[PDB]
């Protein structure tokens, strides 16, 4: 979908994210709902 700041890259339901952790020694996979936060330049408001 679209961000409230008219940007692109928001996923509106369950997302699968693959993250490397601990200096590239662990690979994790989270299937979680990704909610935007409301902080300045932090996925909230009209400035992003």
């Amino acid at each position: 979908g679209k961000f409230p700041s008219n940007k692109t890259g928001r996923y509106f339901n369950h997302t699968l994210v693959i993250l490397p952790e601990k200096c590239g020694t662990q690979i994790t996979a989270l299937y979680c709902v990704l909610q935007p936060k409301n902080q300045t330049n932090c996925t909230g408001h009209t400035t992003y």
């Binding site: 936060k37 902080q39 300045t40 330049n41 932090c42």
Partner: peptide, 28 residues
């Protein structure tokens, strides 16, 4: 929360490595 700098102009150097079928690079 964290102010970052987004500038894709410096991120365009190519150094391409295309797929070589004779080595089976991406064969599952």
């Amino acid at each position: 929360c964290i102010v970052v700098d987004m500038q894709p102009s410096y991120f365009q150097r190519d150094w391409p490595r295309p797929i070589n079928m004779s080595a089976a690079d991406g064969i599952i």
